[PDB]
Amino acid sequence: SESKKLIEEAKKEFDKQLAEGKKEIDIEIEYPKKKYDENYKEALEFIKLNSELRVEYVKKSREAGVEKLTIKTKVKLEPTENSDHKLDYEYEEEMSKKALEKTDEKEYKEKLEKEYKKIEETVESNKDYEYEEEYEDKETGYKYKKKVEIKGG
């Protein structure tokens, strides 16, 4: 699938930047601009793979000594003239070295998986769910912005 290929290219670029010894890694994975008609399950797979990929990102950045890691994920299935069905998802995460040090992998994986499960449940059920989220821990230098908008006609 296209989502799996995008995830593989992102993995390879992340590993290439790790091997080169970078202290500032900025990974941005954007699903191609498509319509909601046929791509909803593929977008759900894209979100699931990005969620599973951020957990590996955090470990491989902390062990490599990365000083600042930014992971950005974006999917936008736009509505057609016929329906109001739409699926917008944007998740940006910025972690400093202390942030990478203080991340509990278990709680992080649980949070990502619960968020994705709620997204999948809302998308499958044809329900409306819109939420924005901005978090900033200044002491540990952890920040994230998340915007999700799920509409079923």
Ligand SMILES: [Ca+2]
């Ligand atoms: Ca609805």
Ligand SMILES: [Ca+2]
């Ligand atoms: Ca709105």
Ligand SMILES: [Ca+2]
């Ligand atoms: Ca609205």
